[PDB]
Amino acid sequence: QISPEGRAAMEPIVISAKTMLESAGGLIQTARALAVNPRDPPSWSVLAGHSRTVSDSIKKLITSMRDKAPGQLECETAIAALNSCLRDLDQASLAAVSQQLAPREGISQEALHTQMLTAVQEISHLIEPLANAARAEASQLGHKVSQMAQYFEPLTLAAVGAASKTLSHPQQMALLDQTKTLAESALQLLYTAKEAGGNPKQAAHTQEALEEAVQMMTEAVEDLTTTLNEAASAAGVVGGMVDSITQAINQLDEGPMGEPEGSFVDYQTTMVRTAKAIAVTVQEMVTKSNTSPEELGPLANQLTSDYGRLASEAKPAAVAAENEEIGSHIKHRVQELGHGCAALVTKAGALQCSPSDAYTKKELIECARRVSEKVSHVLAALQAGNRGTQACITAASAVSGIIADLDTTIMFATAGTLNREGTETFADHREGILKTAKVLVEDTKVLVQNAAGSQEKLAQAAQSSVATITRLADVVKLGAASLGAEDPETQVVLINAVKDVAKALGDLISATKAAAGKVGDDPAVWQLKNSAKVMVTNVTSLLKTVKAVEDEATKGTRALEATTEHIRQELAVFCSPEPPAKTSTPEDFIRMTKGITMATAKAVAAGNSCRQEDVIATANLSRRAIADMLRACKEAAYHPEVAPDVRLRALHYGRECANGYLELLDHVLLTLQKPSPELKQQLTGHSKRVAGSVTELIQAAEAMKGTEWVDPEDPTVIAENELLGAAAAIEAAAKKLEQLKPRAKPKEADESLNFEEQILEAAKSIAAATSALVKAASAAQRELVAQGKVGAIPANALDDGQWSQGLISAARMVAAATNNLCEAANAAVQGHASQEKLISSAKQVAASTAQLLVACKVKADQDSEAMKRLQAAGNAVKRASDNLVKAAQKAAA
Amino acid sequence: SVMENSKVLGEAMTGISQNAKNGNLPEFGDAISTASKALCGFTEAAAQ
Amino acid sequence: DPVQLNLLYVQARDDILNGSHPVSFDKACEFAGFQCQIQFGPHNEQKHKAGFLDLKDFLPKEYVKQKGERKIFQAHKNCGQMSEIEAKVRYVKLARSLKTYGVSFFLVKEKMKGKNKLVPRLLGITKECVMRVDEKTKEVIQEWNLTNIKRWAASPKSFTLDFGDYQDGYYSVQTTEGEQIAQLIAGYIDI
Amino acid sequence: VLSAATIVAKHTSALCNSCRLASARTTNPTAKRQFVQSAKEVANSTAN
Numbered sequence A: 001q002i003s004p005e006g007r008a009a010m011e012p013i014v015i016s017a018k019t020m021l022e023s024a025g026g027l028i029q030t031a032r033a034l035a036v037n038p039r040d041p042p043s044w045s046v047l048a049g050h051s052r053t054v055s056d057s058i059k060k061l062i063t064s065m066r067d068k069a070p071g072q073l074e075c076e077t078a079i080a081a082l083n084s085c086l087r088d089l090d091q092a093s094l095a096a097v098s099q100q101l102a103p104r105e106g107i108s109q110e111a112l113h114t115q116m117l118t119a120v121q122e123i124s125h126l127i128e129p130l131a132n133a134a135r136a137e138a139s140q141l142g143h144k145v146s147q148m149a150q151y152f153e154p155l156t157l158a159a160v161g162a163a164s165k166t167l168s169h170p171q172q173m174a175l176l177d178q179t180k181t182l183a184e185s186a187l188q189l190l191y192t193a194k195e196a197g198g199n200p201k202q203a204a205h206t207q208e209a210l211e212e213a214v215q216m217m218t219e220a221v222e223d224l225t226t227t228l229n230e231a232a233s234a235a236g237v238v239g240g241m242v243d244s245i246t247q248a249i250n251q252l253d254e255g256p257m258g259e260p261e262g263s264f265v266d267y268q269t270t271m272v273r274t275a276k277a278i279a280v281t282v283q284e285m286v287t288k289s290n291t292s293p294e295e296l297g298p299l300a301n302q303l304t305s306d307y308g309r310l311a312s313e314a315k316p317a318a319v320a321a322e323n324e325e326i327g328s329h330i331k332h333r334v335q336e337l338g339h340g341c342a343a344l345v346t347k348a349g350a351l352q353c354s355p356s357d358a359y360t361k362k363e364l365i366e367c368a369r370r371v372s373e374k375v376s377h378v379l380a381a382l383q384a385g386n387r388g389t390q391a392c393i394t395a396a397s398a399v400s401g402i403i404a405d406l407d408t409t410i411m412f413a414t415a416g417t418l419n420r421e422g423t424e425t426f427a428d429h430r431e432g433i434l435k436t437a438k439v440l441v442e443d444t445k446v447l448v449q450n451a452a453g454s455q456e457k458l459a460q461a462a463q464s465s466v467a468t469i470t471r472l473a474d475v476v477k478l479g480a481a482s483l484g485a486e487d488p489e490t491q492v493v494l495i496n497a498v499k500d501v502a503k504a505l506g507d508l509i510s511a512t513k514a515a516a517g518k519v520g521d522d523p524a525v526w527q528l529k530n531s532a533k534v535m536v537t538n539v540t541s542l543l544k545t546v547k548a549v550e551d552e553a554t555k556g557t558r559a560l561e562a563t564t565e566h567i568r569q570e571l572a573v574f575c576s577p578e579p580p581a582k583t584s585t586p587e588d589f590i591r592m593t594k595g596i597t598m599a600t601a602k603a604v605a606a607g608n609s610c611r612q613e614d615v616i617a618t619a620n621l622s623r624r625a626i627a628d629m630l631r632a633c634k635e636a637a638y639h640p641e642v643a644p645d646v647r648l649r650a651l652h653y654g655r656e657c658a659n660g661y662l663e664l665l666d667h668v669l670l671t672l673q674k675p676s677p678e679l680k681q682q683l684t685g686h687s688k689r690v691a692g693s694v695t696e697l698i699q700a701a702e703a704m705k706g707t708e709w710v711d712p713e714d715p716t717v718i719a720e721n722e723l724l725g726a727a728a729a730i731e732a733a734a735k736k737l738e739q740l741k742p743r744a745k746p747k748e749a750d751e752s753l754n755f756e757e758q759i760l761e762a763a764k765s766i767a768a769a770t771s772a773l774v775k776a777a778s779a780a781q782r783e784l785v786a787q788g789k790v791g792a793i794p795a796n797a798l799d800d801g802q803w804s805q806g807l808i809s810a811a812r813m814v815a816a817a818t819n820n821l822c823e824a825a826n827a828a829v830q831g832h833a834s835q836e837k838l839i840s841s842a843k844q845v846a847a848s849t850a851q852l853l854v855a856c857k858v859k860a861d862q863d864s865e866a867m868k869r870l871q872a873a874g875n876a877v878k879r880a881s882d883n884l885v886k887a888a889q890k891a892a893a
Numbered sequence B: 001s002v003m004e005n006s007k008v009l010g011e012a013m014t015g016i017s018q019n020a021k022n023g024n025l026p027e028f029g030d031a032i033s034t035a036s037k038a039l040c041g042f043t044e045a046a047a048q
Numbered sequence C: 001d002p003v004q005l006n007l008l009y010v011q012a013r014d015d016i017l018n019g020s021h022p023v024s025f026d027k028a029c030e031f032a033g034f035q036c037q038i039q040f041g042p043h044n045e046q047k048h049k050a051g052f053l054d055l056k057d058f059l060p061k062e063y064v065k066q067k068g069e070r071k072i073f074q075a076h077k078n079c080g081q082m083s084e085i086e087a088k089v090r091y092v093k094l095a096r097s098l099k100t101y102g103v104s105f106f107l108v109k110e111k112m113k114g115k116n117k118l119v120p121r122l123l124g125i126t127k128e129c130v131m132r133v134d135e136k137t138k139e140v141i142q143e144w145n146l147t148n149i150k151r152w153a154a155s156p157k158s159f160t161l162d163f164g165d166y167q168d169g170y171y172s173v174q175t176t177e178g179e180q181i182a183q184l185i186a187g188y189i190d191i
Numbered sequence D: 001v002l003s004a005a006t007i008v009a010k011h012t013s014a015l016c017n018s019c020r021l022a023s024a025r026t027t028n029p030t031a032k033r034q035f036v037q038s039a040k041e042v043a044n045s046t047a048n
Helices: A004-036 A041-066 A072-098 A109-136 A138-164 A169-196 A205-234 A241-253 A264-290 A293-313 A324-353 A359-384 A390-415 A430-449 A455-480 A489-513 A523-549 A555-575 A586-609 A612-635 A647-673 A677-702 A715-739 A755-788 A797-830 A835-857 A867-888 B002-022 B025-047 C004-018 C025-040 C069-079 C084-097 C178-186 D002-023 D029-046
Strands: C104-111 C118-125 C129-134 C140-145 C151-154 C159-162 C171-174
Touching: A004 A041, A004 B002, A004 B025, A041 B002, A072 A138, A072 A169, A072 C151, A072 C159, A109 A138, A109 A169, A109 A205, A138 A169, A169 A205, A169 C104, A205 A241, A205 A293, A241 A293, A241 A324, A264 A293, A264 A324, A264 A359, A264 A390, A264 A797, A293 A324, A324 A359, A324 D029, A359 A390, A390 A455, A390 A489, A390 A835, A430 A455, A430 A489, A430 A523, A455 A489, A489 A523, A489 A555, A489 A612, A523 A555, A555 A612, A555 A647, A586 A612, A586 A647, A586 A677, A586 A797, A612 A647, A647 A677, A715 A755, A715 A797, A755 A797, A755 A835, A755 A867, A797 A835, A835 A867, B002 B025, C004 C025, C004 C084, C025 C069, C025 C084, C118 C171, C118 C178, C151 C178, C159 C178, D002 D029
Parallel strands: none
Antiparallel strands: C104 C118, C104 C171, C118 C129, C129 C140, C151 C159, C159 C171
C-alpha cells in the first residue's frame, strides 16, 4: 500500500532529479554543436550555464538525502513515550510504598494479569525481527518504534492498577522494578538503534551494543514472564498458559523455519529427556490430586513453560530428519500431547478453586492416562528411526543411578554399616566380579566394532552394557559386604575401583553418542578406541584390585597403582578448560584445601608405619579428597562473582598441588618398595611443598571470594536449631502414615491388593526407625557441642561451616526423603501406577540416611553413645528400605 | 552510489568541456559515453 | 597538637577497623603502612618479612583476603625514616582528603540501570549534599544537592528519593535503615 | 561457445541459490519438496 503523505514528501526529490535530466538534455545537444564548431563565444557561456544548472541541482539533491532522516523523527517521539511512562513508574513507586493510592474495585487482578501477559507476548514477538530489521532497513526503524512505544503507555496503566490492589508489599513493588528494567532496556535499545541508524558503513562496535541490547531485552522477557504467570499460578487461573500451548501450537503450524546448525541426533537426545520429565511430573500431580490440590498451581505452569521448550526443540526436527514423512509424523504427536495437557491444566485450575470436588479428580485421571499412552507414540517413532542414540540416553540415565547405587555403598563402609553378611568372604565373590569382567571386555571390544553399522546391533550392545554393569554392581556389593565392617578401608577401595570404571564406562558411551553408525577416522572415534583402552587399563586394574585385596604383602602396593591411574584420568580433563554446570562455593573449596593438612598426617604416617592396610586408608582418603577438590577448583572457578583473572591462578595452583601430590604418591610407592627411614623423612619434606601449594591455593581462594563475608552465618548455631527442627518433622512425617486411612473408595484407589499393607508396615518401620534415628542424631550433635570435637575457632570455621551447612542439609534431605517416601506411600495405597518411582523413593531415603551418617561421622567416632544408636537404627532403616525396595519391584509392574 | 557519480559527472562537467576546448573529438566522445553510463546508474539509484 | 591529633588518629583508625569510614585499597594500604609506622617506629626491611603479623588489627575482614601485605611492606618502603608525629599528621590529612570523612555512610543494595542485577553501593549524607559511592573504587559516582531533592520515602526493606523534574528518574535502593536516613534528612531543616 | 556458456552456468547457480532462498521461506512443504528437485534438475541439466 502506498501513502500520499510520503508521496508528497518524496516528491521534491523527483523535482531535482527530473530537472537534472533537463539540465542534461540541453547539455549534450549544445555539446553536439561544439563537436562541429570548437570555438564559439556564446557557446562557452551557455555550456557553463548548463553545468551550473547541473551543479545547482547537485547540491540540493545531495542534501535532501541527509535531510531525509529516515526513522529519526519517530524514535524521538518514543523517547517522550518512555519519559512519560517512567514518570508513571516514579509516582506509583511513591504512592505504593506509602499505600496512599486508591485501587479500582471494578477492575480485577487476573483480568489485568491477562492483559499484561498478552502485551509482553506481542512485544517479544517483535524484538527478534527488530534486530534484523534494524541493520537492514532504516525506514523500518521508525516503523517499529511506532508499534513498540504505543504498547507501554497502557501497559504501565495496567501495571499501576494491579499494583494498587496488590496485598503483598514486596510483591507490589517488585512488579514496578522489572517494568522499569523493561523500560530502560528498551531505552538503551532506543539509544543503540538511533546512533547506528541501520548503517552498514558504521562499524561493528555498535553492533555489539545492539546484541547487548538484545540480551538486555531478553533479560526483560524472562523477568516479566516468570513474575506474572507464577502470580497467576498462585490462583487457579488458567488463561494465557493454556493459550501458551496454542502459542506453541501455531509456531509448529508455521512449519520448518530453516536448516538447523545442530545435528539431528543432537536434538533427538534433548527431546527424550524432556519427554521423560513431563511424564513423571503429571504422575506427581496424581499424588497431589486428592491429597494437596493447592500445590498444583505452578506445577502445570512449569509444564506450560516446558512444553514451549518441547515445541522449540521439535521445531528443527522435521528439516533435520532425512524423510519428511517421518518428520511430519513427529510434529502432530506434539500437538496430541498439547491437546491433552490443555485439558489437564484447565480441569485442575477449577479443581484449584474447588478442592472438595472429586469427579474432576477422576476426570483428571483418564486424560493423564491418555497422554501417557500418547507419549509412548512420540518416542516409538524415534525408536522406528535408526538415527538418534535413544538407547544411550537410557544407558547414561541408568548407570548414573548405578553410580547413585554405588554412592550408597561407598557410604556404607565409611559409616561402618556394611557388616559381614553371613559366611561371605573375599574368596567367595572374587570370581563373579571377574567373570562379569570377562564379558565386559568383549562388550567393550564390540563397541568399536559397532561404531559403523545398523542401529539394532548398536542398541543391543548398549542395553547389554547396562545389563553387564548391573550384574557387576550386584556382585560388587556381595564382595564389599564380604569383607566386614571391622576393616572398612578395603571395602572402599573395592567399590571405588568399579566406581571409576563406571565413570569410565559412562564416558565410553559418550564416545558412541557422537558416533552412531559413523566412520572411525575421527579422533573422537579414535577416543572410542582410546577411552576403552583407558577402560582396558581399568578393567585389568579390576583384575589387579582383586589381586590387591587377596594378599597382604602387595595389598596397598597394588591398590595405589589403581589410585594414581584414576587421578591421571581426572587430571587429563581437569587441565582441559571445561565450564561446569554446577556452581560451587569457594568455602567448600576451602574445606577441601584445609583437609589436605589432615590428609598429609595420614599419608606420611601410613608410609612410616609401612602397613599396607594404612596405605589403603591413605589411598581411600587421598582419592576422595583429590576428586572433589579438582571439581571444586573447576566449579567455583566459573562462578560469575569470581574474577576471571584469579581463577586461572587457582587453576595453576590447583594443578601443581595435584602434581606435587602425585609425585608424593610416587614417592610413597618407593616407601612401599624401600623400607628405609631416609625415604620417610622426604615425605615430611614433600608434605610442606604440597602445603606450600595449599597456602597459595588458600590465597587464591582469598582473592576469588565474590561474597562480602567469608562465612554466611555462624556454623554451630544454625546447625543446632535445624537438628531438633527436623527431629520433630520426621515425627510429623511418622504420624502422616498413621493418618492415612486405607483406600476404601474405589475412585482414588488404583490398586487395592495386600502388598499395600506390606508397603505400609515397611513405611511405618521406616518412619519409626527414622524418628528414633533422628533422636540418635539429636544426641549426636549435642555430644558434638558438649565434648567439642568439631571445634569452635573462627579459623577452622571455614573448614567446619561447610560441614555445618551439610549437617543442616543432610538432616533436611533425610527429612525430605522421608517426606517424599511418605508422599510415595500416600501414592502407594491409592495406586501410583509407577514401579520406578517407589524404587527411587526407597533408594534415596537410604541414600540420604548414609549421607547423614557420613555427615555425622565427620570429625567424630563410630562407637559413640549416640553413634551406636545411629548404627543400630541406621541398620534398621536399610533393612526396612531394602525390604521396601524388593516390594517396589513388584509394585504396579 | 550517488557519491560515486557525483565525482565522475562532476569531473565530466570539466572532462567533456576541456576536450571541446582542444577539439579532442575522440577524447570528448568517450567522455560522453562514460558520463551517460554514470547517469544510468545515477537515475537507477535515484528512482530506487 | 601532638595529643589531640593523635586521639583523632586513633578515632579514625578505629573507624577504619570497624569499616564505618570507607577507603579504597591503596588508601587502606597507605593507612596500614602509617599504622605500622606508629606501632613499630621507623621501617627496617630486615625486620618486616613474610608471615610477620596478621592483618586483622590493621585491616577489616574484607581486606585481609586481598594478599597485599607485602605491598603494605612496599608502603613500608614508602615510610622509611618518617617520625611518629609526621605519620599521625599524614594519617589525619589523608583521612580528611577523602570525602568519606565526617559523612554519614550507609551500605545499600541497588538495582542496575537496565540490568536486572543487585549491586552494593554506598550512600553518603552530609547536612547539604548526598553522594553515591562505588563499592570497588570508592569513587563518588554522583552528587545531589539537598535543595534539588524534592521528597523521600522509606519502607521496612526499601527507600526511594524523588527529585522532581530536576532529575529524570527517582533513586530506589534496598535499605534496612532508611527510616533513620529519612530522620536525618528531616533533621536538615536549616534552610 | 565457451564464454557464453560460463554466463549461462553462472545463472544456473543463481537459480540454485534462488531455490534455496525459496525453499527456506516457503510455507507449503509440497512446493518446498518441488524446490528441492528444482535446483537438483538444474544441476542434472547443467552438468550433463
